[PDB]
Design a protein around this ligand. Structure first.
Ligand SMILES: CCCCCCCCCCCCCCCCCC(=O)OC[C@H](COP(=O)([O-])OCC(O)COP(=O)([O-])OC[C@@H](COC(=O)CCCCCCCCCCCCCCCCC)OC(=O)CCCCCCCCCCCCCCCCC)OC(=O)CCCCCCCCCCCCCCCCC
Ligand SMILES: CCCCCCCCCCCCCCCCCC(=O)OC[C@H](COP(=O)([O-])OCC(O)COP(=O)([O-])OC[C@@H](COC(=O)CCCCCCCCCCCCCCCCC)OC(=O)CCCCCCCCCCCCCCCCC)OC(=O)CCCCCCCCCCCCCCCCC
Ligand SMILES: CCCCCCCCCCCCCCCCCC(=O)OC[C@H](COP(=O)([O-])OCC[N+](C)(C)C)OC(=O)CCCCCCCCCCCCCCCCC
Ligand SMILES: CCCCCCCCCCCCCCCCCC(=O)OC[C@H](COP(=O)(O)OCCN)OC(=O)CCCCCCCCCCCCCCCCC
Lengths: 88, 41, 48, 476, 85, 55, 66, 101, 455, 98
């Protein structure tokens, strides 16, 4: 499995943000004792996106001029990646 | 014969798992000398 | 700069993956088993 | 030939691929409140490339103003409100530099290579030509003949004409399938100052322009200059988001007097920003390339399948041997042409027309389509690894020189919104699965409608119907 | 005007712009002057073919699965009749 | 001790609050998931799905 | 798992492993060695559980049949 | 404690695996017809709960060396299944440091 | 990690990583040097110029070319260009090329560099080129040939195609061939770079073997690398057993010097009757007006000539370049050992145009130190552009070593371009205009300019 | 640049045997053609028969540890890094052949 790393939606006119990502899921059954699940939302990562989201929350809620970010289709939402902490 | 190991050095097998190094687990990527040798290069 | 492996070497990690005492019950300072109407289930409960 | 060949008896040593990963300085990026972007990659040196990349090609024309983008490119160099053409040329000459303008289907760029001490003057001239250039009718009437001569010259490039045919066949009814220069009747009479002004107003907006710096440059200085000059651009309407439909079919130009035949066969693929972009790149590198100087030394299953039938003695039980006199293939190359919406993935074969009503091209296309089906069904691990390593090397080979690095930065900034770090790119390249690659190959190749472009002796090149019947097999 | 003592622009105008020799002109026989006797197109113009023959686009289906499915399903009865017969 | 200093600092910090308590502009997760499915290509079918589908 | 023959030969009493070049299986009827790999009960389960996998996959026809 | 494997080849409606499960055990018509009740939410990481637990944490998330430890690959499992993870981890690490000092 | 039944991903950051006030950083070392040269005790010479890049080129330079031919062997080197790349005794063409191509290495077509050597160039990541198998394959190719008749037939076909295509698609390159052929009339530099028609039937395996015996010797082979550390290269070309199995001999070949005519002078071809007109230019006449210029032997005069050539090129080519600007002119400076050519190749040339070019050159002669600064700056911009590119670095190294025998890194040329002097350029132009011209015509039309009408 | 340092050409190929024919050819000499008699050559040509070939000896070399005179000769030549020993490629078999 290899999907996109978690991102942050941000709506401009409304000025409202929120994290998002792809959640894998499967039919429930017995587990495995010798296995702690790896990072599945952010594959092949040390799970820093949580820290980046926590750090960037103050930046985003305070009001960010994200005109330099791509949009999502024809809506008012733009995607901010959580690869590195957001300062702007 | 497959992948034959060379030498009888230590491998973390089922019987032997070794003594954890909590100092390295906690101080990962952070130097120890700022705490054990304060203010020295 | 990497030495011969030893059991107390600098690069030995805690065993939290491989299960040993499966049927134990963790004990220590733990929250009260409060019950509420409609609130999301706690991770550490028998119900999911 | 009395000399023995020991290569058939000896045990040979196999070289293996081991990549080199030099850490380059990260590509910094900033954005003005207007939205105009500023990207910069600095490296130790004495010369730097500074340019402006614009996201407005000929893709946005409706056959009433086809070629207006190229007309605008030629008109930007005819003088501005402050400077004249002579003054611009004098400034460039004093800097000892050349101002290059390049126009594509979905990108344009104006760039200058200079010393680090001429960066502010270069940026000044770029802003002057891009924003403040006056485009009067008289000058518009004085460039029509030069553009006509350029049209007649570019019509004489067989490869460019072939790709224009491929795009005209694939994308009919949308500007993406029109030629960059446009119809001759449009060059001489139709394009007007009104069309040029409308194009500039609509497509030269803030959020669709980037200032790119590569080499011994200062990102802070670039940002200050960009705010000084490019801060007043309008936040115009968003880039058009329409549906460009792919039409399978054929465009065949008959010229039996040509010495070589060029055949391009392409399939529809998703855009450049689709998650399948890396898998399609790996497919392109999997099909590989072949040149006549290699002989039988074709390193891919594809090219090899098409080449060894001109060395096979073709001895059969009930039929006479039929071995080709010589290998007629001049070259085979796998290509991928992506665009924000769509893509064309295929192969481009150049070979001699051969004896009239022969079987050379029948065999070539037979084996090409068989190999496409085979890779759609199964791919080997060793060839998968070869393809990934070749993609690594090819991606690295394009970053030679400040101008090439700046071009890559600008294209990625306009397409993906920001440059992807090479390591990050490579991080996504080692996570590809052979099963995923097989699925991508089967999705777009098997039992799909292709687009064919032919230039040369079409007497021997198979027609579309036959080609449509070989994208699938009875066995499957 | 002079770049390092050279009137480069002048030199350019005298050196950098050679004349280009184009194709020879073919004298037209007087019976070929009427336009329709020197064709430049077949029967139908693009506009015509774009209004009558090309299917209506389906933006949700950019790979013609609908057309392929319909054609193969419509072929099935031919094979069925031939087999039974 | 450094442990005491850190504990006291954290205790004082949480009095101000945490993002889950202080953040005002924040969309519901259902709207974000619906937008994800309605606009972005599925990582399996490589196309845009209308809504959530099990198969 | 992988054979330990190099260590066994370079061990301390290599004469005990001369029989290992006759018609003789290593795991069943050879003298165990100080540095041998640890053998588990259900090797399929032992190798699959730490990777999060159940031993048998229904999509594989061979596994489904087994 | 389960690795789904390859999500692509198990998401199809009809599969050899699903038919085998129907024949021998683990799958059936109740799964095709009624997936809301017999597959339901399913088992996997919870992005919403991870985000909630991350945003509930104090500055201990910034000051913790967790992300460079060999257990950084278990970050999401613990963040979801260990409420108040980062504060406890920060106290643990500061305890180690003060023992060292 | 280094455990059994333990997650491979369960590994911490490397020991060369530090975490300081948040974001992490990495610790590493320094590398790289300048230009380095060595000679193997068997005669082979190795030149290296490391620049720290990740992409490297490795070239085996073999001493053979038109300057070593006569009127009866004309074009034989072209066969040698390909025959050595075909099947050998110990490794066929299939074994080598595929083995190199499947290892992520780009194998370039062999080329003739200064009419005096054949370069076999390979391009790839430095780590892939440093291994001793690539160099081993090149050693096999150069030291143990086979020259099979069927391969020679294939090479005959290839050379016919090369000549015909260059004539049809590279009229300026063909014009350069004519320019040299008539420039150095009775001297080695005036030999043809293309196989003449007659010799197409004459050259075969026996002639190739005789030429290989004549040119055999480790003294006729050189190795040049541009992004490989010097020692590694020495570790790669010295691990070959085949080098140890080869006859040890230092055998050099020498060629005489040259003089210069060219001329008001003409190669006649009716292109409109030879090729289809749609996809090639068939209605044009190619005129090369050239003068004698210094070679690479004297670095000062070479740098002055570079400045002069850049000044002439910038004063003719358009300053503002568009996408589809056609190719009508070229200002060329072909530099050799102790002699060279500098001139203007054009289509539909005119007496007025050629007079203007000569007057521009003379004007360049009279420039002062202050006026020479602009042209020196433009030449420096070009030189730095060469410095920053590994392909340009390789080209410069090969040319500098081949013509003079003394390597010369591109950066060194920069140091020589900013030491150019007005007196030096004045003397160089006095040398240029003090000798007859070459008004090498090639093409078809009868209205072409003539020297008597210029001078 | 102006100075060419002298580096030895093939230091790795000094003090290795360079006599062809070597001494191994004396030790592992096969003056009577193939070393295995007809019946033996008949039994090693089939995977099944081969098992019976060694199983006839209740305690003898298995089919994996068994070596021939020619195999030992090649091993001996390779072990001594003789300059003039050009290694030969074993017959590579595709699927069906195997
Ligand atoms: C030359 C070889 C071409 C080839 O690959 O033929 C394989 C040939 C046809 O496969 P195909 O070329 O992929 O055609 C499939 C198209 O969908 C066929 O659809 P279509 O639209 O092309 O319709 C034409 C098709 C069927 O339609 C007709 O023939 C017209 C209707 C029947 C007319 C008589 C009443 O004609 C045939 O099947 C002709 C068969 C004779 C050999 C060709 O395979 C078989 O006949 C079966 C192969 C497997 C069994 C072994 C048979 C040999 C022993
Ligand atoms: C006919 C039926 C014959 C008996 C059942 C055979 C089932 C397997 C058939 C098959 O195709 O297997 C391929 C399959 C190939 O294995 P693979 O998956 O490729 O893995 C390679 C290795 O096995 C490496 O894998 P591994 O070592 O990890 O083993 C995989 C693991 C996989 O196993 C599991 O995951 C589950 C195993 C459960 C074992 C019991 C645990 C305690 C109870 C738990 C609750 C379950 C109860 C059983 C199920 C009912 C539940 C309601 O264990 C097994 O598969 C074998 C475990 C022991 C059970 C089978 C014993 C067969 C030999 C004894 C015969 C006498 C007793 C039976 C009646 C006859 O074979 C095996 O895995 C078994 C090894 C060979 C067994 C036969 C040995 C010779 C027996 C000769 C005497 C036969 C009986 C007397 C005949 C007299 C003349 C008429
Ligand atoms: C082999 C040569 C090449 C042939 C290629 C294909 C030809 C074109 C396609 C076929 C068209 C005709 C199909 C007829 C089907 C309808 C009749 C039928 O079968 O009924 C089933 C029914 C089935 O009856 P039943 O008895 O099985 O049904 C059960 C009924 N209960 C239980 C109540 C008892 O009748 C028959 O089968 C009757 C016997 C066969 C009748 C044959 C009719 C003529 C066939 C040829 C016609 C074609 C033109 C002439 C060719 C002459 C050649 C010499
Ligand atoms: C009634 C109609 C039955 C036939 C139609 C098909 C039914 C569905 C497919 C058959 C297999 C059952 C589903 C797969 C499975 O693993 O089922 C486990 C099931 C225990 O689950 P259960 O308690 O039945 O849950 C539903 C509560 N009413 O227990 C079993 O599987 C027991 C054996 C099968 C029982 C079939 C009867 C219906 C069970 C619901």
């Amino acid at each position: 499995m290899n999907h996109e790393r978690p991102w942050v939606f941000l709506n401009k006119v409304t000025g409202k943000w929120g994290a998002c990502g792809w959640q894998p899921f499967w039919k429930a059954t017995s587990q495995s004792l010798n296995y702690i699940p790896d990072n599945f939302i952010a594959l092949r990562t040390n799970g820093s996106w949580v820290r980046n989201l926590w750090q960037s929350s103050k930046v985003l809620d305070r009001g960010l001029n994200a005109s330099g970010y791509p949009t999502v289709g024809t809506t008012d939402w733009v995607r901010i990646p959580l690869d590195a902490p957001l300062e702007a | 014969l497959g992948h034959m190991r060379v030498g009888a050095l230590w491998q973390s097998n089922a019987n032997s798992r070794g003594l954890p190094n909590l100092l390295k687990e906690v101080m990962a990527a952070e130097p120890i000398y700022p705490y054990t040798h304060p203010g020295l290069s | 700069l990497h030495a011969d492996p030893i059991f107390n070497g600098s690069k030995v990690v805690r065993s939290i993956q491989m299960m040993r005492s499966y049927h134990r019950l963790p004990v220590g300072p733990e929250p009260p088993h409060l019950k509420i109407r409609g609130a999301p289930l706690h991770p550490w409960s028998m119900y999911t | 030939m009395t000399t023995p060949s020991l290569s058939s008896i000896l045990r040979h040593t196999r070289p293996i691929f081991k990549e080199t990963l030099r850490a380059a300085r990260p590509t910094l990026q900033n954005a003005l409140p207007n939205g105009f972007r500023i990207a910069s990659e600095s490296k130790d040196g004495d010369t730097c490339t500074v340019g402006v990349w614009i996201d407005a090609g000929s893709r946005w024309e409706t056959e009433k103003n086809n070629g207006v983008a190229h007309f605008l490119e030629h008109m930007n160099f005819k003088g501005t409100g402050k400077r004249s053409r002579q003054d611009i040329e004098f400034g460039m000459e004093k800097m000892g530099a050349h101002l290059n303008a390049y126009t594509s289907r979905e990108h344009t760029c104006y760039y200058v290579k200079c010393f680090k001490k001429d960066v502010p003057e270069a940026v000044d001239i770029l802003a002057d030509i891009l924003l403040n250039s006056k485009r009067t009718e008289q000058d518009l009437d004085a460039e029509r003949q030069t553009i006509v001569q350029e049209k007649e010259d570019v019509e004489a490039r067989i490869d460019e004409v072939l790709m224009d045919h491929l795009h005209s066949a694939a994308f009919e009814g949308s500007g993406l399938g029109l030629s960059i220069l446009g119809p001759l009747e449009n060059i001489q009479k139709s394009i007007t100052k009104g069309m040029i002004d409308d194009f500039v107003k609509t497509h030269y907006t803030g959020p669709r322009m980037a200032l790119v710096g590569s080499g011994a440059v200062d990102h802070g200085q670039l940002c200050d200059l960009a705010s000084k000059y490019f801060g007043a651009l309008p936040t115009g309407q968003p880039k058009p988001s329409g549906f460009t439909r792919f039409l399978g079919g054929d465009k065949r130009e008959t010229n039996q007097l040509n010495p070589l035949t060029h055949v391009a066969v392409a399939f529809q693929t998703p855009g450049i920003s689709h998650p399948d972009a890396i898998k399609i790149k790996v497919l392109e590198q999997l099909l590989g390339s072949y040149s006549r100087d290699k002989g039988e030394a074709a390193y891919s299953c594809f090219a090899r399948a098409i080449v060894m039938d001109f060395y096979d003695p073709k001895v059969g039980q009930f039929f006479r041997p039929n071995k080709a006199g010589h290998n007629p293939i001049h070259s085979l190359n796998a290509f991928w042409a992506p665009y924000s919406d769509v893509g064309l993935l295929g192969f481009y074969a150049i070979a001699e027309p051969g004896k009239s009503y022969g079987h050379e091209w029948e065999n070539i296309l037979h084996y090409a389509m068989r190999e496409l089906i085979r890779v759609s069904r199964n791919i080997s691990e060793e060839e998968f690894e070869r393809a990934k390593n070749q993609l690594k090397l090819q991606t690295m080979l394009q970053l030679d020189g400040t101008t090439n690095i700046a071009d890559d930065i600008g294209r990625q900034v306009l397409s993906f919104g920001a440059r992807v770090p090479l390591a990050s790119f490579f991080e996504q390249l080692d996570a590809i699965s052979r099963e995923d690659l097989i699925r991508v190959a089967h999705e777009y190749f098997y039992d799909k409608d292709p687009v064919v472009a032919v230039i040369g002796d079409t007497d021997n090149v198979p027609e579309y119907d036959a080609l449509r019947a070989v994208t699938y097999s009875v066995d499957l | 005007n002079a770049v390092g003592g050279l009137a480069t622009s002048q030199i350019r105008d005298l050196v950098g712009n050679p004349a280009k020799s184009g194709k020879p002109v073919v004298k037209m026989p007087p019976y070929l002057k009427p336009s329709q006797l020197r064709p430049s197109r077949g029967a139908y113009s693009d506009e015509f073919v774009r209004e009558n023959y090309i299917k209506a686009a389906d933006p949700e289906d950019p790979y013609n699965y609908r057309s392929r499915a319909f054609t193969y399903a419509a072929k099935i009865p031919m094979w069925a009749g031939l087999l039974a017969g | 001790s450094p442990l005491e200093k850190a504990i006291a600092e954290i205790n004082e910090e949480i009095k101000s609050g945490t993002p889950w308590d202080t953040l005002k502009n924040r969309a519901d997760p259902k709207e974000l998931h619906a937008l994800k499915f309605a606009q972005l290509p599925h990582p399996i079918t490589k196309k845009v799905e209308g809504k959530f589908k099990y198969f | 798992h992988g054979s330990n023959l190099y260590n066994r030969v370079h061990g301390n009493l290599p004469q005990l492993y001369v029989e290992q070049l006759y018609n003789t299986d290593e795991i069943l009827d050879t003298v165990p060695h100080s540095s041998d790999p640890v053998h588990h009960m259900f090797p399929k389960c032992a190798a699959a559980s730490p990777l999060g996998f159940r031993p048998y996959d229904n999509n594989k026809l061979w596994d489904a049949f087994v | 404690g389960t690795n789904p494997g390859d999500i692509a080849l198990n998401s199809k409606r009809f599969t050899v695996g699903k038919f085998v499960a129907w024949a021998c055990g683990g799958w059936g018509l109740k799964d095709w017809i009624f997936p809301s009740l017999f597959i339901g939410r399913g088992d996997g990481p919870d992005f919403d709960r991870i985000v909630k637990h991350t945003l509930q944490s104090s500055s201990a998330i910034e000051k913790v060396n967790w992300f460079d430890s060999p257990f950084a690959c278990y970050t999401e499992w613990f963040v979801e299944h260990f409420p108040g993870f980062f504060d406890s981890r920060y106290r643990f690490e500061m305890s180690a440091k003060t023992i060292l000092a | 990690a280094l455990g059994d039944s333990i997650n491979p991903n369960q590994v911490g950051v490397g020991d060369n990583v530090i975490r300081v006030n948040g974001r992490l950083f990495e610790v590493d070392k320094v590398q790289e040097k300048g230009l380095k040269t060595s000679v193997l005790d068997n005669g082979t010479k190795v030149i290296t110029l490391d620049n720290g890049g990740s992409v490297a080129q490795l070239t085996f330079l073999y001493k053979d070319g038109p300057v070593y031919e006569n009127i009866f062997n004309a074009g034989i080197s072209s066969f040698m260009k390909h025959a050595l790349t075909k099947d050998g005794l110990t490794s066929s063409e299939y074994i080598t090329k595929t083995f190199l191509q499947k290892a992520g290495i780009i194998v370039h077509e062999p080329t003739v560099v200064n009419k005096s050597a054949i370069a076999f160039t390979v391009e790839g990541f430095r780590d892939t080129l440093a291994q001793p198998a690539v160099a081993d394959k090149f050693w096999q190719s150069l030291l143990f040939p086979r020259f099979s008749p069927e391969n020679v037939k294939e090479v005959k076909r290839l050379v016919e195609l090369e000549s015909k295509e260059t004539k049809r698609d590279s009229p300026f390159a063909y014009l350069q061939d004519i320019l040299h052929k008539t420039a150095f009339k009775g001297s080695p530099l005036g030999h043809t770079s293309f196989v003449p028609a007659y010799n197409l039937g004459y050259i075969d395996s026996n002639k190739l073997f005789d030429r290989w015996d004549a040119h055999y010797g480790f003294g006729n082979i050189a190795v040049i690398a541009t992004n490989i550390e010097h020692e590694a290269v020495l570790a790669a070309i010295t691990d070959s057993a085949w080098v140890a199995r080869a006859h040890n001999k230092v055998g050099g070949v020498a060629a005489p010097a040259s003089k210069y005519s060219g001329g008001e002078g003409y190669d006649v071809v009716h292109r409109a009757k030879e090729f289809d007109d749609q996809f090639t230019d068939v209605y044009s006449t190619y005129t090369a007006y050239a003068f004698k210029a210094p070679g690479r032997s004297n670095l000062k005069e070479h740098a002055a000539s570079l400045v002069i050539a850049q000044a002439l090129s910038n004063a003719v080519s358009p300053v503002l370049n568009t996408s589809f600007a056609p190719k009508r002119l070229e200002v060329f400076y072909q530099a050799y050992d102790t002699v060279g050519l500098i001139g203007l190749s054009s289509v539909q040339a005119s007496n007025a145009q050629l007079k203007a070019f000569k007057a521009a050159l003379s004007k360049i002669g009279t420039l002062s130190e202050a006026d020479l600064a602009v042209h020196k700056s433009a030449a420096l911009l070009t030189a730095y552009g060469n410095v920053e590119s590994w392909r340009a670095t390789q080209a410069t190294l090969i040319d500098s070593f081949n013509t003079t025998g003394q390597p010369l890194s591109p950066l060194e040329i920069v140091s020589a371009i900013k030491a150019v002097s007005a007196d030096t350029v004045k003397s160089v132009v006095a040398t240029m205009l003090g000798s007859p011209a070459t008004l090498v015509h090639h093409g078809d039309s009868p209205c072409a300019p003539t020297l008597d009408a210029l001078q | 640049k102006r100075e060419w340092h002298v580096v030895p050409a093939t230091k790795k190929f000094a003090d290795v045997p360079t006599e062809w024919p070597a001494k191994e050819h004396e030790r592992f000499a096969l003056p009577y053609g193939p070393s295995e008699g007809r019946i033996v050559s008949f039994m090693r040509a089939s995977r099944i028969r081969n098992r019976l070939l060694f199983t006839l000896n209740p305690t003898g070399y298995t089919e994996d540890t068994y070596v021939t005179k020619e195999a030992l000769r090649r091993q001996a030549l390779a072990e001594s890094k003789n300059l003039w020993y050009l290694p030969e490629r074993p017959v590579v078999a595709d699927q069906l052949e195997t």
